CSV table of C-alpha atoms in Angstrom, one decimal:
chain,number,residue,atom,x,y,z
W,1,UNK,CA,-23.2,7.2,1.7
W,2,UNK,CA,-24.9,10.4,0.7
W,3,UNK,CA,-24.2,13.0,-2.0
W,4,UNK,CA,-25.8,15.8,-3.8
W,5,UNK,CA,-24.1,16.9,-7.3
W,6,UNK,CA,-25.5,19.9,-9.1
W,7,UNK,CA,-23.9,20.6,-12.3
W,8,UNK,CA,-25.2,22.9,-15.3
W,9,UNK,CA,-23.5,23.3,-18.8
W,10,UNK,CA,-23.1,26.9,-18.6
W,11,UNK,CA,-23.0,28.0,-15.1
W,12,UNK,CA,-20.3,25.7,-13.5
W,13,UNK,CA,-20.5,22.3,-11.2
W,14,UNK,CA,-21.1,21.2,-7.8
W,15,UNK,CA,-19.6,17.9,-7.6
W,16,UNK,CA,-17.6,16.0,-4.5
W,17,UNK,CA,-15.2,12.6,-3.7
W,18,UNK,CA,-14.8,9.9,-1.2
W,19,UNK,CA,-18.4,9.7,0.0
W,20,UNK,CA,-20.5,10.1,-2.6
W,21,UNK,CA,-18.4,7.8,-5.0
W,22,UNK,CA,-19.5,9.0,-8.6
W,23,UNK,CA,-18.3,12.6,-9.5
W,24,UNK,CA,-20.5,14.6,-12.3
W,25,UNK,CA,-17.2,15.9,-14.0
W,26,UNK,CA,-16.1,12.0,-14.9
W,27,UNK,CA,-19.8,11.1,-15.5
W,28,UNK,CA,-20.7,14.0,-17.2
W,29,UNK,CA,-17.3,13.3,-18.9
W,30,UNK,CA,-18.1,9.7,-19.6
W,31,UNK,CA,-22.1,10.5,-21.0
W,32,UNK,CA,-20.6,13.7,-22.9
W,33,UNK,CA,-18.1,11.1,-24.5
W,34,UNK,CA,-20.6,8.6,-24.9
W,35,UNK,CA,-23.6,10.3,-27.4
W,36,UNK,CA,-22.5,9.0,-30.9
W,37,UNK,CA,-20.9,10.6,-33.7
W,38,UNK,CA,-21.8,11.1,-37.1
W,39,UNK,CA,-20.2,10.1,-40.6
W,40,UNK,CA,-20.0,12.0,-43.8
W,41,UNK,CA,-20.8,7.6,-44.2
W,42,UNK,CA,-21.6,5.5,-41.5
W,43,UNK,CA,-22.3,6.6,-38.2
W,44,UNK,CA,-20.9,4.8,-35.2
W,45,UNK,CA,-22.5,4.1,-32.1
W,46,UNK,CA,-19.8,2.4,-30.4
W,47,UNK,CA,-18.1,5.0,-28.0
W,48,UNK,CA,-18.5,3.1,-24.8
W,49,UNK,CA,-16.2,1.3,-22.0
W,50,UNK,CA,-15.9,4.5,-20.1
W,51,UNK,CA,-19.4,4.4,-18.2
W,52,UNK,CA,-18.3,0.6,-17.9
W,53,UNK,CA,-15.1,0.9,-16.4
W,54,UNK,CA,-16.3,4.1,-14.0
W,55,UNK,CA,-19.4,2.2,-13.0
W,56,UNK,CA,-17.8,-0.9,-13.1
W,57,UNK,CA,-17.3,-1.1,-9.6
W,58,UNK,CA,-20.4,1.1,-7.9
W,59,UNK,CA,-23.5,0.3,-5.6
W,60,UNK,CA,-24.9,3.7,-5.2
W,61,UNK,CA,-28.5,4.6,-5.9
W,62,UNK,CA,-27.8,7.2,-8.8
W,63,UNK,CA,-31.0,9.3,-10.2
W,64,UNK,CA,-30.7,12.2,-12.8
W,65,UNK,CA,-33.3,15.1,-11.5
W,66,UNK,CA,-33.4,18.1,-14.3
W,67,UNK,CA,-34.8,21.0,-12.6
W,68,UNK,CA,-34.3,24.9,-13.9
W,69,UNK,CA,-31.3,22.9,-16.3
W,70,UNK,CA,-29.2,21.8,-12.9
W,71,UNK,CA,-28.8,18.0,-13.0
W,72,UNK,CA,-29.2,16.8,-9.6
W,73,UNK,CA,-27.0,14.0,-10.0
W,74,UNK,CA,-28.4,12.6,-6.1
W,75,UNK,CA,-26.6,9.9,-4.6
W,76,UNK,CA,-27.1,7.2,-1.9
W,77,UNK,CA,-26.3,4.0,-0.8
W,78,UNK,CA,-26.6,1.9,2.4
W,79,UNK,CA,-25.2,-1.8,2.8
W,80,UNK,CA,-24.9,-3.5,6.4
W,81,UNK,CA,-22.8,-6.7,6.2
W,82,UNK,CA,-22.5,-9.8,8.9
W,83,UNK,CA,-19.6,-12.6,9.5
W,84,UNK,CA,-19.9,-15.3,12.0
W,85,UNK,CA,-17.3,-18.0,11.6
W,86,UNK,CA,-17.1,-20.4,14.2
W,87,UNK,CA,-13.9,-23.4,13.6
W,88,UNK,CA,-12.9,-26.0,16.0
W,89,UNK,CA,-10.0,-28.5,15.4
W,90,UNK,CA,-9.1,-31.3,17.8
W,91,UNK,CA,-6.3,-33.3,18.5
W,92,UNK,CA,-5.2,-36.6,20.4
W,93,UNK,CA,-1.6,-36.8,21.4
W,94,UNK,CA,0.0,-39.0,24.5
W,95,UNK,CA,1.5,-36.7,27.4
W,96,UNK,CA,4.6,-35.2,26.7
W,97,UNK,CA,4.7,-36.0,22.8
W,98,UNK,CA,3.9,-32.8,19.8
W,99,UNK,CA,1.4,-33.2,17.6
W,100,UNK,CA,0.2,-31.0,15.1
W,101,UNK,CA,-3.2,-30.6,12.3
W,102,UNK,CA,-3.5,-28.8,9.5
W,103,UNK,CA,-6.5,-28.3,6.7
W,104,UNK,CA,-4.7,-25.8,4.8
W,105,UNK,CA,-2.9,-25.2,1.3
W,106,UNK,CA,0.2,-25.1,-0.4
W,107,UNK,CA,1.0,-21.5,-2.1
W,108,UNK,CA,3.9,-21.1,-4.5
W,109,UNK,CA,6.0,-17.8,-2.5
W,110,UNK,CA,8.6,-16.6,-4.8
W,111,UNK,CA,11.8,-15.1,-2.8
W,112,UNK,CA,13.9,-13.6,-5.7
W,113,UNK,CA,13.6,-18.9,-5.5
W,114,UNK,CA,10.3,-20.4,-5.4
W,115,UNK,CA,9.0,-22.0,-2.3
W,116,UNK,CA,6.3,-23.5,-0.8
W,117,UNK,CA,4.5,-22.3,2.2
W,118,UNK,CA,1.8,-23.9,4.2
W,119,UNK,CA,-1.4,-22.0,4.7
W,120,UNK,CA,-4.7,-22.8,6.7
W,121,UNK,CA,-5.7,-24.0,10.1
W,122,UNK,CA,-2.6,-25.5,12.1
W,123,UNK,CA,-3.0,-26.1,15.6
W,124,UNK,CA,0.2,-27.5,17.0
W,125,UNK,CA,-0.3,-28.3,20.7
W,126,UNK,CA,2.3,-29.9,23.2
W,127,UNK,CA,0.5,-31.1,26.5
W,128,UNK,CA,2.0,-32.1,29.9
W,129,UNK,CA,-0.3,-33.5,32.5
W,130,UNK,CA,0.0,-31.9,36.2
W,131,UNK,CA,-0.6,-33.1,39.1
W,132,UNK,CA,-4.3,-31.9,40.3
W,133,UNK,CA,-5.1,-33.5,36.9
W,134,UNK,CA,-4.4,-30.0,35.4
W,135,UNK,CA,-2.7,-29.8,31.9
W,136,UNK,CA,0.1,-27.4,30.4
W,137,UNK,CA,0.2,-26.9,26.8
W,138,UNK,CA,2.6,-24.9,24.6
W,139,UNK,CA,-0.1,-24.2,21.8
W,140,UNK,CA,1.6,-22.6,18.9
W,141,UNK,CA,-1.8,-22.1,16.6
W,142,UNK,CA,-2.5,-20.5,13.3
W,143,UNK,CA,-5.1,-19.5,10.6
W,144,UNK,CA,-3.6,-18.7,7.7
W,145,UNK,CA,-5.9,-17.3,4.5
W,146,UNK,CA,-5.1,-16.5,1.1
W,147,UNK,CA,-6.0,-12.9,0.2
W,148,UNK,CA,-5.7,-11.6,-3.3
W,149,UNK,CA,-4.4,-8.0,-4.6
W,150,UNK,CA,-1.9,-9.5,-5.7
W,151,UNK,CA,0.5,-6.7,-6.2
W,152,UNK,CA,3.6,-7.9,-6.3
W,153,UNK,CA,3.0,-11.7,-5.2
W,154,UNK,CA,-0.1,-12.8,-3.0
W,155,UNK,CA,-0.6,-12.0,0.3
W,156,UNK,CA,-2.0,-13.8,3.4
W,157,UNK,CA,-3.4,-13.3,6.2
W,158,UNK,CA,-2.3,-14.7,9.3
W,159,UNK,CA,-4.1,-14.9,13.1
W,160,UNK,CA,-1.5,-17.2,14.6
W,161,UNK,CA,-0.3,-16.9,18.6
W,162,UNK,CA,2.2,-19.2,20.4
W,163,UNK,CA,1.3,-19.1,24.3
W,164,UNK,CA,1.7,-21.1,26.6
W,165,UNK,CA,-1.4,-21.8,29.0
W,166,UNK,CA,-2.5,-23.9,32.0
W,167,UNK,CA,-6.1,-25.5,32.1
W,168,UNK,CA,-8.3,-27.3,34.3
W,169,UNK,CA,-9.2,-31.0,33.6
W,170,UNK,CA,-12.0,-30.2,31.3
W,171,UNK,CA,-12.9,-26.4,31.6
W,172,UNK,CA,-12.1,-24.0,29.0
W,173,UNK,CA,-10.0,-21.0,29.1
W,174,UNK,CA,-9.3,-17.8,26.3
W,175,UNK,CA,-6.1,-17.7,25.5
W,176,UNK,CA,-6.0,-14.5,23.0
W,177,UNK,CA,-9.0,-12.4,21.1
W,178,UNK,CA,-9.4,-9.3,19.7
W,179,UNK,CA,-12.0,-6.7,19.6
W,180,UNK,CA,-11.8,-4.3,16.9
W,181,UNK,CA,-13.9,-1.5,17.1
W,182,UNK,CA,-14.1,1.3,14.2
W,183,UNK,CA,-16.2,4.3,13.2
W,184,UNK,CA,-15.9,7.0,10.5
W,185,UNK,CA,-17.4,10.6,9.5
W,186,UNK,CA,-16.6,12.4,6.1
W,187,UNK,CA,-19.2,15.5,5.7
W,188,UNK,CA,-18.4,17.9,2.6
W,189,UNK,CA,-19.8,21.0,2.9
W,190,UNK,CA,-20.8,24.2,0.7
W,191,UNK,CA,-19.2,27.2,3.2
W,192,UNK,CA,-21.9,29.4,3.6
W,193,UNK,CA,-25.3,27.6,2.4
W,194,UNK,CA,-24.4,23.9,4.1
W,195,UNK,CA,-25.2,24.5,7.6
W,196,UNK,CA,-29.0,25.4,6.1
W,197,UNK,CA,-31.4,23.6,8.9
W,198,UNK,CA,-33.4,22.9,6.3
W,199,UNK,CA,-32.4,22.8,2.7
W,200,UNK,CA,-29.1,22.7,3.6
W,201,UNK,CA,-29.0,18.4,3.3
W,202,UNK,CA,-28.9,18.8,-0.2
W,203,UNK,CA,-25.3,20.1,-0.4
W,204,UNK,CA,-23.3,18.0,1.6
W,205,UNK,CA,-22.0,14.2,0.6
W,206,UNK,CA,-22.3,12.9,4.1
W,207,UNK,CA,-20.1,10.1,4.3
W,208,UNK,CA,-20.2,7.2,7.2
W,209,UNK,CA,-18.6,3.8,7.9
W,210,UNK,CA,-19.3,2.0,11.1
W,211,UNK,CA,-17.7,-1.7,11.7
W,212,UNK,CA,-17.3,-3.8,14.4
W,213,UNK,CA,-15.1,-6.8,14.6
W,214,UNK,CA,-14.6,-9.3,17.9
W,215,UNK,CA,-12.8,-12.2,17.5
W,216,UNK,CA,-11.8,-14.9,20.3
W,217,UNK,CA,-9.7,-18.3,20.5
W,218,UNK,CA,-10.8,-20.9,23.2
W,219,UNK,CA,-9.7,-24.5,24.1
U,1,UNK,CA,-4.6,-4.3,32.0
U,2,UNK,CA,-2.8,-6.9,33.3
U,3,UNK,CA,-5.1,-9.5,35.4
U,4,UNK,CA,-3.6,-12.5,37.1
U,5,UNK,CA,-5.8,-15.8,37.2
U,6,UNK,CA,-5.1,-17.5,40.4
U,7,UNK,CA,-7.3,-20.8,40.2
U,8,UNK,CA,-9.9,-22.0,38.9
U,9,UNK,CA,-12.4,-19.3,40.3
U,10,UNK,CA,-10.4,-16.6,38.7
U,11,UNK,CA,-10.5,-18.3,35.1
U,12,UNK,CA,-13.9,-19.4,35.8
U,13,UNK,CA,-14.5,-15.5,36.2
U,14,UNK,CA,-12.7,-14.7,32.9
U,15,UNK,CA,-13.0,-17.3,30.8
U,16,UNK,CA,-16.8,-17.1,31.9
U,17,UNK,CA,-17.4,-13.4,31.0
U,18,UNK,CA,-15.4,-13.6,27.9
U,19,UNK,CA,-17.2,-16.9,27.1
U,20,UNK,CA,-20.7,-16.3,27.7
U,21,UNK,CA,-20.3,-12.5,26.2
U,22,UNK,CA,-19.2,-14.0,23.0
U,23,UNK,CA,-21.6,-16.5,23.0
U,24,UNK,CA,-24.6,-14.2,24.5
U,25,UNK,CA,-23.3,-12.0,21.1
U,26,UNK,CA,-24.0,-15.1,19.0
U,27,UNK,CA,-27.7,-14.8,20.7
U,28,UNK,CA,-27.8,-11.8,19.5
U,29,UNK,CA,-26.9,-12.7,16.1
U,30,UNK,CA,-29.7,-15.5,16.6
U,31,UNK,CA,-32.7,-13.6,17.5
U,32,UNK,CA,-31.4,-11.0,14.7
U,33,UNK,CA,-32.0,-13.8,12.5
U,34,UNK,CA,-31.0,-13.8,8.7
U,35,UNK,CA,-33.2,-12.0,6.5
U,36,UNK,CA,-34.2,-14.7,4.3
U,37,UNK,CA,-34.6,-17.8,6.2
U,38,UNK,CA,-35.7,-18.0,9.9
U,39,UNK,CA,-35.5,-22.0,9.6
U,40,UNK,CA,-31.6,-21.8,9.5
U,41,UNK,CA,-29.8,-22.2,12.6
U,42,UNK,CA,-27.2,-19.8,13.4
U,43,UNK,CA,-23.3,-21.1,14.5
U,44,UNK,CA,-23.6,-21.0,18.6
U,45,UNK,CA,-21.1,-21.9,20.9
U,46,UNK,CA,-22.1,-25.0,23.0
U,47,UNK,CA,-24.0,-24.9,26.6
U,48,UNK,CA,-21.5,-24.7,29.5
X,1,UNK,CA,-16.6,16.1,-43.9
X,2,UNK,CA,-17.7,14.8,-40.0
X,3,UNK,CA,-17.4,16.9,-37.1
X,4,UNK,CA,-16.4,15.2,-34.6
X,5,UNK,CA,-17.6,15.7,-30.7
X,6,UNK,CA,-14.7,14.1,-29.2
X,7,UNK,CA,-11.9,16.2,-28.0
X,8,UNK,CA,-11.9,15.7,-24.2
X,9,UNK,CA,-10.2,13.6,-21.6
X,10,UNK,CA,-8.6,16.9,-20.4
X,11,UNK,CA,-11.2,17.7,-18.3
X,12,UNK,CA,-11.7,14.6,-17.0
X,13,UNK,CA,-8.5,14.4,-15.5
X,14,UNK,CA,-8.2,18.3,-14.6
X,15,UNK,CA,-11.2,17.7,-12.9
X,16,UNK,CA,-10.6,14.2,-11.6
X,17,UNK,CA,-9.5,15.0,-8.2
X,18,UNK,CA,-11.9,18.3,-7.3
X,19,UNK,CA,-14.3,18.0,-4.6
X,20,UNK,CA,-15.3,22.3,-5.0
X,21,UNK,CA,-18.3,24.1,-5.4
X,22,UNK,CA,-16.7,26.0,-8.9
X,23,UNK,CA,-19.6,28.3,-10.4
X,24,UNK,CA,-19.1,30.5,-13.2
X,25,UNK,CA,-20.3,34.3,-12.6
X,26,UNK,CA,-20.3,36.1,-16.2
X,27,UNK,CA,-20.4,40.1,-15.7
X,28,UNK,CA,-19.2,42.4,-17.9
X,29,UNK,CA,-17.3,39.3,-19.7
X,30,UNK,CA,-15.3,38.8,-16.9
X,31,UNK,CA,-15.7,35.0,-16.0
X,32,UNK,CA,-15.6,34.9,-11.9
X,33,UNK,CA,-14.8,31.4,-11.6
X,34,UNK,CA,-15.4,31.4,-7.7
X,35,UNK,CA,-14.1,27.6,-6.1
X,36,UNK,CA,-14.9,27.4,-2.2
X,37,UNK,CA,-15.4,23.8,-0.5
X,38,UNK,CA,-15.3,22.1,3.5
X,39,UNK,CA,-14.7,18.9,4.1
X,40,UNK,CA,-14.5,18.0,7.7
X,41,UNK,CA,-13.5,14.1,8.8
X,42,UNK,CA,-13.3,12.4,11.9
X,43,UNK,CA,-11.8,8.9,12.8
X,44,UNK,CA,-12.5,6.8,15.9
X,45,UNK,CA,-10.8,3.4,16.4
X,46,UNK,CA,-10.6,1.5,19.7
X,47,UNK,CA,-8.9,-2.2,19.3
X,48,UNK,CA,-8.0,-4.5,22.5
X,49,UNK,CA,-6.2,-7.5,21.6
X,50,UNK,CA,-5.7,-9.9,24.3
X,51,UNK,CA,-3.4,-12.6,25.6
X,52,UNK,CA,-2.9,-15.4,28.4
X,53,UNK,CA,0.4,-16.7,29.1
X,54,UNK,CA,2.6,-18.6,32.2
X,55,UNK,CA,4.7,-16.4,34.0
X,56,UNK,CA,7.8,-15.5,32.5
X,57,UNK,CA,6.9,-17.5,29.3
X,58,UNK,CA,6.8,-14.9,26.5
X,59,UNK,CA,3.8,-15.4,23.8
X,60,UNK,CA,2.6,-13.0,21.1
X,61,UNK,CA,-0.3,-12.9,18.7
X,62,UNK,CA,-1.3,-11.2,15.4
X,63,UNK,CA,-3.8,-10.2,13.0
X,64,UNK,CA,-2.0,-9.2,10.5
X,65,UNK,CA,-0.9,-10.4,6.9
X,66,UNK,CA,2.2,-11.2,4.9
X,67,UNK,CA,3.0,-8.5,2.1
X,68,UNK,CA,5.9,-10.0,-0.2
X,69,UNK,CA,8.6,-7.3,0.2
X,70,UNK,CA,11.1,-6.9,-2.7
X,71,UNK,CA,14.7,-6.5,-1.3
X,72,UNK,CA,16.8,-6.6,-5.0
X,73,UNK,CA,14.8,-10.9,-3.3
X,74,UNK,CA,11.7,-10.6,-2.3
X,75,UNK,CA,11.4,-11.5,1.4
X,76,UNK,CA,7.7,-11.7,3.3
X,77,UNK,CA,7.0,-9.1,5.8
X,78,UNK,CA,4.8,-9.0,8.7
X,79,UNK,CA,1.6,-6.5,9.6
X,80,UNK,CA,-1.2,-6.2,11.7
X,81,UNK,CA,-1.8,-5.9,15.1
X,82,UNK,CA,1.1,-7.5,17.3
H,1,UNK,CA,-11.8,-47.2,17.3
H,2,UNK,CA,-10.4,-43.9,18.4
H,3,UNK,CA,-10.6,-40.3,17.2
H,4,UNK,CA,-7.4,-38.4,16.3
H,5,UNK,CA,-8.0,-34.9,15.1
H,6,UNK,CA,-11.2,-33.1,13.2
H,7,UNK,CA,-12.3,-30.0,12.4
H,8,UNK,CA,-15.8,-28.9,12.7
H,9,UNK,CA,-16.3,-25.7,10.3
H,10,UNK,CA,-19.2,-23.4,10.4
H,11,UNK,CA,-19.4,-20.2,9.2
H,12,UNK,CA,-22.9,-17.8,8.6
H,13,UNK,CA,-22.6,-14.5,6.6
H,14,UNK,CA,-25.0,-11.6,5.5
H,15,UNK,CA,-24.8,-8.8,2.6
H,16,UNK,CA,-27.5,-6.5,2.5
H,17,UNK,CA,-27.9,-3.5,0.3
H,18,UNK,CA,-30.4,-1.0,1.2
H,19,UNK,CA,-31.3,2.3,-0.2
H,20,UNK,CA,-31.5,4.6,2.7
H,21,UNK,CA,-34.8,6.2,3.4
H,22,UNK,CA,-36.9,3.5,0.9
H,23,UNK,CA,-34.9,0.7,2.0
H,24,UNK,CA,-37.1,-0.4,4.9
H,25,UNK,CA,-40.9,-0.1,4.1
H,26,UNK,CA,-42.3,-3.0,5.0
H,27,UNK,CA,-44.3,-3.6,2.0
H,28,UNK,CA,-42.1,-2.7,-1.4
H,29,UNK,CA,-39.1,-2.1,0.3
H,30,UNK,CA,-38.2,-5.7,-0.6
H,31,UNK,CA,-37.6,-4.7,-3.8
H,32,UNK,CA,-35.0,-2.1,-2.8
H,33,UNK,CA,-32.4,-4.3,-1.3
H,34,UNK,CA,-29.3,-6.8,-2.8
H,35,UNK,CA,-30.2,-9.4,0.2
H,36,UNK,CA,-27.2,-11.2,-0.2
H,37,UNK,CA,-26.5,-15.0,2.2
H,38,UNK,CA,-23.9,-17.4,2.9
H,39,UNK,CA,-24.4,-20.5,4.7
H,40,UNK,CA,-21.8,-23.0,4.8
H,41,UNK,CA,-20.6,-25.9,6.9
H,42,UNK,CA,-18.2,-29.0,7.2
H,43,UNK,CA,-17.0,-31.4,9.4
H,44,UNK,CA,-14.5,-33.3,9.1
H,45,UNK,CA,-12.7,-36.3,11.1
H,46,UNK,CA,-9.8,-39.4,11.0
H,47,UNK,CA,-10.3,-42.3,13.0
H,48,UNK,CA,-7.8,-45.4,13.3
């Protein structure tokens, strides 16, 4: 993230969204709500829990540069992140004969009529040896997690797939995968004075999100 | 794309590209090592 | 007997959703309130799920998650990438 | 003895938080950055 906000009390406000993350009209709404009052007797200083609920949830680097009376509310932020989850199960059935695993939970689902639904890392296989000494398996597999929200009940979220492969004696094969790839661009401009080569950074609330996401099931 | 897989050459093909590409990415989250700690290993797949 | 600084929250939500450049030009006491903003956005998303089946032995997959639903009964609905 | 089923977890994870020009100097720009971790791991079996 990236953003520039000049605002001044008497001249009007430059101020943006969804990229730099922090306008100055609810800041400078928040701060201008936030300097105390005074009594006739007492005098409070206890207007607060608006800076805290609007930068309850915030990362950004956010300085306050007074220059000519602009406030060059500047704004920035950068924050890579990196998964790696690697899960193996195993099983030991006879030929011919289901078996299933699971490590999961058991999560109260309302329908209307509470009931209980199973969560977590199920794995239900059904080998047949061939001849060759080559095996068939109807794998039915899941990973199930519990995400919150919570809107108006909890919500999952599922990776399951139900094939039906044929393997070698001990090689591996991939039976499913997925590789998500993402990018993003959200520039906000001034019209005239944002395409400045040189002074011209400091107006627009360049946004950016790059992700990346592969994902693979083997056996 | 559909791709048939004939024998055991065909899903050694596959199965080795898709495979080794995963785990070569796993590599690559190795030698990118962890910011903090270099003596931590990393989850990689096994050899062959 | 206090004057109270306090009379706001109108402006805060008049000006909740406003991404402009709004200056205020005074000549002649005529306020030129001049508003003028660009935004430009651009999206780029490439996914490639993947599957291995039998022939003619049907098989799906997913990524997805299960949203409760509220029919009346609320009944679990499927998303994500099938 | 023989083994039934199992699960071997691992999982790794990384949250970094820079700021964007100061973030990587290679001297203070430690003390820019939210380096965040997550190692984790479990293994798990049933015999008979």
């Amino acid at each position: 993230n990236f953003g520039v906000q000049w605002g001044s009390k008497d001249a009007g406000l430059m101020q943006f969204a969804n990229g730099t993350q922090i306008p100055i009209g609810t800041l400078g709404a928040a701060i201008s709500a936030a300097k105390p009052q005074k009594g006739s007797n007492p005098d409070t200083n206890g207007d607060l829990s608006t800076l805290a609920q609007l930068l309850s949830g915030f990362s950004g680097t956010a300085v306050g540069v007074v220059k000519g009376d602009w406030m060059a509310l500047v704004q920035a932020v950068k924050n890579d992140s990196s998964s790696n989850v690697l899960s193996t199960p195993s099983i030991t059935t006879l030929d011919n004969q289901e078996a299933f695993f699971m490590v999961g939970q058991d999560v109260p689902v309302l329908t209307g009529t509470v009931e209980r639904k199973k969560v977590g890392i199920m794995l239900k296989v059904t080998p047949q040896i061939n001849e060759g000494n080559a095996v068939q398996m109807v794998i039915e597999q899941e990973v199930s997690k519990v995400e919150g929200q919570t809107s108006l009940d909890v919500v999952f979220g599922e990776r399951k797939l139900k094939t039906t492969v044929l393997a070698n004696d001990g090689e591996l094969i991939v039976l499913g995968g997925l590789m998500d790839d993402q990018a993003g661009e959200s520039v906000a401009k001034v019209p005239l004075l944002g395409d400045i080569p040189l002074i011209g950074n400091l107006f627009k609330s360049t946004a950016d999100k790059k992700e990346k996401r592969n994902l693979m099931v083997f056996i | 794309r559909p791709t048939i897989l004939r024998d055991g050459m065909a899903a050694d093909g596959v199965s080795q590209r898709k495979y080794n590409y995963m785990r070569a990415e796993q590599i690559y989250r190795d030698e990118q090592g962890l910011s903090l700690m270099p003596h931590t290993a990393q989850p990689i797949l096994p050899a062959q």
